Each structure stands twice: as C-alpha cells, then as structure tokens.
Design a protein around this ligand. Structure first.
Ligand code: 1L9
Ligand SMILES: *[C@@H]1O[C@H](CO[C@@H]2O[C@@H](C)[C@@H](O)[C@@H](O)[C@@H]2O)[C@@H](O[C@@H]2O[C@H](CO)[C@@H](O)[C@H](O)[C@H]2NC(C)=O)[C@H](O)[C@H]1NC(C)=O
Ligand code: NAG
Ligand code: NAG
Lengths: 267, 96, 202, 239
C-alpha cells in the first residue's frame, strides 16, 4: 500500500525575499529533490523518471518550473490583497500525491498548510478550506477558484497523472522498494536502564523484545524509528530493571531480512 | 512556534578506534529555518552532510545530519542546534 | 518588451483585407486580447483567445492564437473607413485578478476611402457674423489627389480629411484654405497638383 | 460594467499638484492606473485591491495612489513634471481576469503657462454655388489663435450633437511654424443635404471646448485669464 508524496515548503521572509524547496517520497524512499537554487528537478534514484518517455518528463517539469515562479508571485499578491490582516514571515507547505491500492485503485490528495496549520485542499474540482480554517481564507479561495485554467490542470494532475506516473514508478523501482537489509544489534546500559540497539534494517517493520528466557518482559519500551543516511532504519528498546537483575537477560530481534533467524543477544 | 527534538546515535555499534558514522536527528520544529553543527571536543566538524529538509504528516519539520567519526575513550561528540524557538542554542551530547 | 506587434503601421485601400501579427514571450500565457483604439478614443475589446490553439471571430474581425508558437493574428475582412485606428495586443499571464497584463505597442492601420464619383471643386464660404472674412474649400476630389501646405506662411491649408454622410452612404474628401490678408480661392491651391477639370465657379 | 475618469483633459504647470480620479459603480475590489505613451504599450502605475490599500505598479515614481472608497481610485501628482504628460487610463475588475477600462485622460504639463490662450471660433456658411452643383451644403468651422493644442471641436444641430457627415483635422496646424510656443489653428466640416441647410428652423453651432487654466492658477499678465472654457459660433438655416 504505497503512498507517493510531493512535499513542498516555501518561506516568505518579507515583501521581497522568498524561497521554495521540495522533496518527493515513495513510501519511505526519497525519489526527487528540488532545491530553490536548481532550475530542474533532480532524480535521487536511477528509476526516478518512472516510465515516462523523455518528452513526457520534460513537458512535466516545464509545467512545474512555471508553477514554482507563479506560486511565488501569487502568494505575494495574496498578502497584498489580505493586508493588513496577514504579514511576513509566511510559511506555506504543500502535500500532494496519491495512495496506491490493490488492483488499479487509488486516491489523490493536495493539502495546503499555512503557518503550520492545515487549512486548504483541492477537492473534486475546486479549492476549499477545511474545518478550523480562518474565514479570511475565503477571499484567496475565491480568487483561486476563478482561475479555471489552473483548476483543470490540477484535476488532471491528481486524477490521471499521479496514479499513472506512480504505477510506472513501482515497476521501475521494484528492486529498491523490495530491498531487504539485515539489522545489527548491540546492548548497553545507563543509570538501571538496559538498551537494545537495532540498526541498519530495511524495511521498517521490526520486532524487538527483552526476554528472560521465554517470558517476554512486559516493561520493554520501544523508541521511535530513527533514520540512517543510507536509507535504513534504527530503533531501540529500553528495559528498566533494578541493579543485579541483569543476569540472564536477552534481546530478541525479528525482521523479514533475517529469514526466521531471530537475532539473539545475551547480556 | 515549536521547539526541536535532538537525537544523536551512531550507524554501527560504537567501538573505540574503529571508524563509524555519527547521526544527528533534529525533528518536530517550526519554522523551518535552522542552524545545526556537529561538534568534536567543542569544535565544529568540517565535512558534515545534510539530507534535504522534509516534514511529517503532522506538518512539523525534520532534517538529518551525519559525519564520519572514530570514537575514542577520550573525545566527546555533540550536536548544537540554533532555532528561533530557543533563546540559548541547545547542545545534546553523544552517549554510547 | 515581451509583446511585439507587426507591422508597425500599414496603409490599405477600403475593401481590401489585412492581417496583424502579435508575437510574445509572456509566461504563462492564460489569454490574449485584441483591442481597437480610435485616435483620441480609448480601448474597445474585439476578442479574447483562451485555448492552446484557439480561433475566434466577431463581425468582419477574426483571430487565431497558437500558444505553442506564442503567436496570434488578427484578420480584418473587407476593411471599412472606420477601421482606421491602432490595434493593440494584450497578453494576460493568469486566469484571475492575480494576473498582470502585458501590452504591445500597437499596429497603426490607415484605410484609404473609396471615392466612386469625384467632382473636384473649390467654393468660397462666408463668415456668419462678418461677411467680409472668408474661407476656400477644396472638395469632392479622390484619394489619388494629395494636398500640399502653403507657399506663403501667412496663408494656411489644412490637410485633406474624409467625411461620411452615413444616412446617404456618401464619402467626400475636403481641405480648407484661408488667409487673413488680395488672396483668392482660384489662387489658393496652385501649390498642389489638383485635377485639371476642377470646378472654379462664380 | 462602466468606469469613469475626471477630468478627461487637463493642462497643468510644472510644480503644480494634479489629481486624476476614477469612479467605478460595479462593486469591484480591484482598480488600476495605467499611462499610455506613443511607442509603448500601457504601463501600470499603481493598483488597489480594496478600500484603503494601494500598490506599487511597474513605473510608480512621481505618483501616489489613493483608494478612499470601493468606488474611487485617485492618481495624485504631487509635483507635476513635463514627463508626466501622457494619456492616463484607469480600469477595474473583480476576482476574474477581465479589466474594464476607463475612457482615458490627456494630461499636458507645461513648464510655463504664459502662452495659454483661448481660440477665436468662426463658422463659415455654405456656398450657393456648392448647393446648386451638389445638392449639398458644407459648413466650415475654424478655431484659431489658441495654445496649447488641447481643444475638442464638436458640432451641434438643434441642441443635439451630430457625428454624421463630420470631419475634423486630426492635427492642429501651427500659425507661425518657425517661432516657438506658437499658437494653433484647426478646421472642421459638416456636410448636410441642401434642404436641411435651407431650413430656417435648424440651428447650427460649432463648439470648441478649450482646455486652459483653472480658476486657481496665479495669473500675472494683463489679458483675461485663459481659463478652460467653451468658445462657439452659430448660424440658422436659410432659404
Ligand atoms: C501533484 C503531484 C502529482 C504529479 C506527479 C509528478 C511528480 C514529479 C516530481 C516533481 C514534484 C516536485 C514539485 C512539488 C510541488 C508540489 C506539487 C503541488 C503543486 C500542484 C499545483 C500545480 C498547479 C499547476 C497550474 C499552474 O501552474 N498554475 C499557476 C499558473 O497559472 C496560469 O498558467 C496556467 C498554466 O498554463 C498551462 O498551460 N497549464 C497546463 C500545463 C500542462 C497541461 Cl497538460 C495543461 C495545462 C494556466 O494557464 C492558468 O489558467 C493561469 O492562471 C497559478 O499561478 C496558480 O495560481 C499557482 C498556485 C496554485 C497552488 C495554490 C495553493 C493554495 C495556497 C493557499 C493560499 C494561501 C493565501 C495566503 C495569503
Ligand atoms: C476529477 O475527479 C473529481 C472527483 O475526484 C476526487 O477529487 C479529486 C480532486 C481527488 O481528490 C480524487 O482522488 C477524488 O476522487 C471529479 O469531481 C466531480 O465532478 C462532478 C462534476 O464534474 C461533481 O458534481 C462532483 O461533485 C465531483 N466530485 C467530488 C468528489 O467533488 C472531477 O470531475 C474529475 N475531473 C477530471 C478532469 O477528471
Ligand atoms: C528580507 O529578509 C532577508 C532574510 O531574513 C534579509 O536578509 C533581507 O534584507 C530582507 N529584505 C528586505 C527588502 O527587507
Ligand atoms: C530562489 O530562486 C528564485 C528564482 O530563481 C530567486 O529569484 C530567489 O532569489 C531564490 N531565493 C534564494 C533565497 O536564493
């Protein structure tokens, strides 16, 4: 069940200076990078272009190049319209893409956040605010909905291009998405808290438990998943024990890559 | 405004004299403008690589810094972060 | 300078057709609009082309737009005298009030009137209040005839001008001569090559 | 959806303050001021998104906008300059793209008003010779001796303006082309059916609206203060 995400972040410091950067994720793997500095979208994977011809890609990027410039001016001209109600710094974030399903089914989203709160979305054929949004957004929404040219484009982007493009992506990138990478684990302790360190595994699903023989220690706390640079994960479980109980404790690690060879690590 | 969470951990298991990679994971902050230094014995480290910024479903920003390092019994490694949310720059130290 | 028009100016005879070009580099190019502007007047909109490849018409005016070529033409069919004006090209970079318009400098069209039945004469006209001061009127000549400004600097001749008695469908050329101070009508236009059969009455 | 401008035509002196105003009745958030100079397209000076807001256009220097209300957008020249001579267009729109343009305003900025002069207006009656030869009657209006060239000649028949069978010179001609700050002349014609001229109950009037000084410009000279005024000339039909 893969989720394709085009994340855009834009900052407007004052009336003049502004910048826009973007990344693109398929599941948890970055496929693209678009720095404000660059005039072109970067592939961060040999199969980033999915299954579009050279001519389809170049046309796609040209649409984006134009959008990025237009988005900048348009925001700046919305501040002008809304003022003195709203003012710089302004931070806009876009989250757009589609989620792919069994068979040939999908769902597309285009979500906008302003100063960190989700406020606007494309839905159906128009822009609309969401529950919780300030009422003043109604004018920007009305101005944006006046532009039929953008509406139909965006409808085409979400309805057809995303699902189509991404399908191409999952074909071309099967060996990376289906990569298996074994974890590695090491024990350690702190004033007493014992720590099982699991690092280098892919994909993300993983099972880690502290155990006295067979009894799974109910006090195990899993930490968050932290990323490594090389597109693998890192996680740790802590068990709180009273000093002198460390004898005969073990860490058991399960992960698809190990192929039923659970990692066993005794204290 | 939101205040950033810093997490320092190493790629491979820490072992003295053995070259490794140190990670600094900075998360859950807004606005996205931010200054991150990795520090050996108080001093800034030269070749320090950064991932592109991104943000989670909850809209808050995250970024990953990393660098080569050889852990020794002697040296201390740290990640210092400056952000508008904080008056004083926050330093989280490495612990094996 | 992102909107360029061609030709800069053109002279055509009444009834003939003509084509005006507009080439641009505006980005993006939501729509293109053609204006007509009479001398003195302001801007009357003729058509607005919106599609990637678009075609429009409005009376004798028709217009194409090729967005890929970033190029547009305005065709006038069977030009009339009222077509004499400046034709302005305007590109709009958004489909909403968030856009800016980008105006070309224009193309000047002049249309030469079709006088069917020339009847060149030079009459004298009297002042309504003071019957001793007067003017000389050269009228009903065709457009092949051109008027020339005076020899004497104390004599004046206006350039030719065409008028339309619309209710009669009748057009006539006319120019006016006069002097404040021994100056007469038959001597007024020696300075111009006037038809050899011009009517000098009285 | 209509939009008006006032004044339509203005003569002004270097240093003076001039205000151009735009009234718009269509309830439009957005208004715009442009200037048209021969050899360039229209250029944006200032714009406005709503009562209270004004915004810099492409060429804002020398100009100050004012949007007191939803209905009015004014362009203020705090210190008029020869270079601010132009035709000025105003426009409005809603959130859609179309802008609705005003009829325009000719501004002239002179360095010095010493030469402003209203014209003499004579009307010249149809030739008996013409009438009998063509079955048509040409009236001639002649406006002369005026400066600057900001005059609008118009023809009236029985208190109503007529456009048919009219032609006015497109350019005023100089009376002393050599000398500088020369006064101008201008002529115009009205052709009618002879029976229409021969009708005693028809009142003919040639009218020149001359654009000069305002009743607020200081005037040092001895001659009457060459104010914006209407000078005309007149005659009845006759058999
Ligand atoms: C959606 C992703 C699925 C695609 C998968 C491919 C992935 C490729 C990887 C690269 C991705 C990295 C970029 C990440 C960016 C995040 C992606 C989301 C952006 C989607 C929206 C694209 C809009 C395209 C239309 C456009 O260019 N419009 C502009 C340009 O508009 C003009 O040109 C347009 C473009 O002309 C075209 O020809 N378009 C076109 C192009 C191709 C085709 Cl086939 C058809 C039409 C049209 O003519 C319009 O009518 C005209 O108005 C116009 O200025 C818009 O107003 C721009 C703003 C739109 C966003 C609004 C967000 C709301 C924020 C809330 C405001 C808060 C207020 C604060 C005060
Ligand atoms: C594109 O699809 C929409 C509806 O699809 C949803 O909205 C998309 C923007 C995206 O979020 C998808 O994943 C969703 O499935 C169509 O909108 C409908 O249009 C009709 C009239 O045309 C309208 O009456 C319905 O209410 C709309 N549906 C909704 C849910 O609002 C739209 O027509 C499609 N357009 C194209 C060009 O394919
Ligand atoms: C805008 O902000 C940037 C960065 O904060 C600053 O360097 C620049 O001077 C500012 N520009 C203006 C016009 O205020
Ligand atoms: C980002 O790129 C745009 C477009 O090239 C540029 O004008 C702008 O200055 C850039 N911003 C920064 C902060 O570099």
């Amino acid at each position: 069940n893969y989720t394709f995400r085009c994340l855009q972040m834009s900052s407007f410091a004052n009336r003049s200076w502004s910048r826009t950067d973007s990344v693109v994720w398929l599941g948890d793997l970055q496929t693209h990078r678009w720095s404000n500095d660059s005039a072109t979208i970067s592939f961060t994977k040999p199969w980033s272009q999915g299954k579009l011809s050279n001519q389809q890609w170049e046309k796609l990027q040209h649409m984006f190049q134009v959008y990025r410039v237009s988005f900048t001016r348009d925001i700046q001209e919305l501040v002008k319209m809304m003022s003195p109600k709203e003012d710089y710094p302004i931070e806009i974030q876009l989250s757009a893409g589609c989620e792919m399903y069994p068979g040939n089914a999908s769902e597309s989203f285009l979500h906008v956040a302003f100063q960190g709160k989700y406020v606007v979305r494309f839905w159906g054929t128009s822009w609309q605010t969401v529950p919780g949004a300030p009422s003043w957004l109604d004018l920007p929404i009305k101005v944006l909905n006046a532009d039929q040219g953008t509406s139909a484009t965006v409808q085409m982007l979400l309805n057809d291009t995303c699902p189509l493009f991404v399908r191409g992506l999952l074909e071309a990138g099967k060996s990376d998405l289906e990569k298996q990478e074994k974890p590695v684990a090491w024990l350690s302790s702190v004033p007493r808290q014992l720590v099982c360190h699991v690092s280098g595994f892919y994909p993300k699903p993983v099972w880690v438990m502290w155990m006295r023989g067979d009894q799974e220690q109910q006090g195990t706390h899993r930490g968050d998943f932290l990323p490594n640079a090389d597109e693998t994960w890192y996680l740790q479980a802590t068990l709180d024990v009273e000093a002198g109980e460390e004898a005969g404790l073990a860490c058991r690690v399960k992960h698809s890559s190990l192929g039923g060879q659970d990692i066993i690590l005794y204290w | 405004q939101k205040t950033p969470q810093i997490q320092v951990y190493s790629r491979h298991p820490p072992e003295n004299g053995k070259p490794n990679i140190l990670n600094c994971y900075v998360t859950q902050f807004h606005p996205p403008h931010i200054e991150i230094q990795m520090l050996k014995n108080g001093k800034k480290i030269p070749k320090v690589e950064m991932s592109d910024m991104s943000f989670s479903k909850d809209w808050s920003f995250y970024i990953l810094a990393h660098t080569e390092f050889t852990p020794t019994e002697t040296d201390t490694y740290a990640c210092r972060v400056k952000h508008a949310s904080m008056a004083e720059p926050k330093t989280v130290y490495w612990d094996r | 300078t992102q909107v360029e028009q061609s030709p800069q100016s053109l002279v055509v005879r009444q009834g003939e057709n003509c084509v005006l070009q507009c080439n641009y580099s505006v980005t993006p190019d939501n729509h293109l609009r053609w204006f007509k502007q009479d001398t003195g007047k302001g801007l009357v909109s003729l058509t607005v082309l919106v599609d990637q490849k678009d075609k429009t018409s409005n009376g004798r005016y028709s217009a194409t737009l090729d967005k890929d070529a970033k190029h547009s033409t305005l065709h006038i069919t069977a030009t009339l005298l009222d077509d004499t004006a400046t034709y302005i090209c305007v590109v709009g970079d958004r489909g909403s009030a968030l856009g800016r318009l980008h105006f070309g400098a224009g193309t000047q069209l002049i249309v030469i009137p079709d006088i069917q039945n020339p009847d060149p004469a030079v009459y004298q006209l009297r002042d309504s209040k003071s019957s001793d001061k007067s003017v000389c009127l050269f009228t009903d000549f065709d457009s092949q005839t051109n008027v020339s400004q005076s020899k004497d600097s104390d004599v004046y001749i206006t350039d030719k001008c065409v008028l339309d008695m619309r209710s009669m469908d009748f057009k006539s050329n006319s120019a006016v001569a006069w002097s404040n101070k021994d100056f007469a009508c038959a001597n007024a236009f020696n300075n111009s090559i006037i038809p050899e059969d011009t009517f000098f009455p009285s | 959806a209509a939009v008006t401008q006032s004044p339509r035509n203005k003569v002004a002196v270097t240093g003076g303050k001039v205000t151009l105003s735009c009234n718009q009745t269509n309830n439009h958030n957005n208004m715009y001021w442009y200037r048209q100079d021969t050899g360039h397209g229209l250029r944006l000076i200032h714009y406005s998104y709503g009562a209270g807001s004004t915004e810099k256009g492409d060429i804002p220097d020398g100009y100050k906008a004012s949007r007191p209300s939803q209905e009015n957008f004014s362009l203020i020249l705090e210190l008029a300059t020869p270079s601010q001579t132009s035709v000025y267009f105003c426009a409005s729109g809603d959130e859609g793209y179309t802008q609705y343009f005003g009829p325009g305003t000719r501004l002239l900025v002179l360095e010095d008003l010493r030469n402003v002069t209203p014209p003499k207006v004579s009307l010249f009656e149809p030739s008996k010779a013409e009438i009998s030869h063509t079955q048509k009657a040409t009236l001639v209006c002649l406006a002369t001796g005026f400066y600057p060239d900001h005059v609008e000649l118009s023809w009236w028949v029985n208190g109503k303006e007529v456009h048919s069978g009219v032609c006015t010179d497109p350019q005023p001609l100089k009376e002393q082309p050599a000398l500088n700050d020369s006064r101008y002349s201008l002529s115009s014609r009205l052709r009618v059916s002879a029976t229409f001229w021969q009708n005693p109950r028809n009142h003919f009037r040639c009218q020149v609206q001359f654009y000069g000084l305002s009743e607020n410009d200081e005037w040092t000279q001895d001659r009457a203060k060459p104010v914006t005024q209407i000078v005309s000339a007149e005659a009845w039909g006759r058999a």
